[PDB]
Amino acid sequence: KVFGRCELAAAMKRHGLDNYRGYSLGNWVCAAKFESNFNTQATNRNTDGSTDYGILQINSRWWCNDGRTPGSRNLCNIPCSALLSSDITASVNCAKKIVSDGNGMNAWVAWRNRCKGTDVQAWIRGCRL
Numbered sequence: 001k002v003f004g005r006c007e008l009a010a011a012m013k014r015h016g017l018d019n020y021r022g023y024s025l026g027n028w029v030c031a032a033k034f035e036s037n038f039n040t041q042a043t044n045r046n047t048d049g050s051t052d053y054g055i056l057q058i059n060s061r062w063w064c065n066d067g068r069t070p071g072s073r074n075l076c077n078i079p080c081s082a083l084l085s086s087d088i089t090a091s092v093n094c095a096k097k098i099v100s101d102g103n104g105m106n107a108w109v110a111w112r113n114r115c116k117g118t119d120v121q122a123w124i125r126g127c128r129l
């Protein structure tokens, strides 16, 4: 599913991501924009052999199981395929664990490089939330 911007903001809020760990909703929407362009089915292979899955490009090195990432963990206790669903529940629940892991949203390199410090409220501007 390719979400609309406000549609995704609303779904993230529904699932308790707004201000989670102090990160406003616009931070999450901005991260999703640059990770997946709001496409739940996005996948990308990393140089290390791991793969990133879903709207927030969650990595199989630590967070989900895909059966083909040697030496990896599955700390969200989910198949990586769950992160591609039109229903964002699994991605949101896993993102909550990731953002709590110590480095906040810097876990998402694209958030650090493209969202951090910017006017992230622009991403939810105009939305009925």
Ligand SMILES: [Cl-]
Residues within 6 Å of the ligand: 005, 033
């Ligand atoms: Cl957009």
Ligand SMILES: [Cl-]
Residues within 6 Å of the ligand: 024, 025, 026, 027, 120, 121, 122, 124
């Ligand atoms: Cl915001």
Ligand SMILES: [Cl-]
Residues within 6 Å of the ligand: 065, 066, 067, 068, 069, 070, 071, 072
């Ligand atoms: Cl594996």
Ligand SMILES: [Cl-]
Residues within 6 Å of the ligand: 068
């Ligand atoms: Cl393969």
Ligand SMILES: [Cl-]
Residues within 6 Å of the ligand: 072, 073, 074, 075
């Ligand atoms: Cl594990």
Ligand SMILES: [Cl-]
Residues within 6 Å of the ligand: 065, 066, 078, 079, 080
């Ligand atoms: Cl699994």
Ligand SMILES: [Cl-]
Residues within 6 Å of the ligand: 011, 086, 087, 088, 089
């Ligand atoms: Cl949803």
Ligand SMILES: [Cl-]
Residues within 6 Å of the ligand: 021, 022, 103, 104, 105
């Ligand atoms: Cl933080």
Ligand code: NA
Residues within 6 Å of the ligand: 060, 061, 062, 063, 064, 065, 066, 069, 072, 073, 074
């Ligand atoms: Na894994």
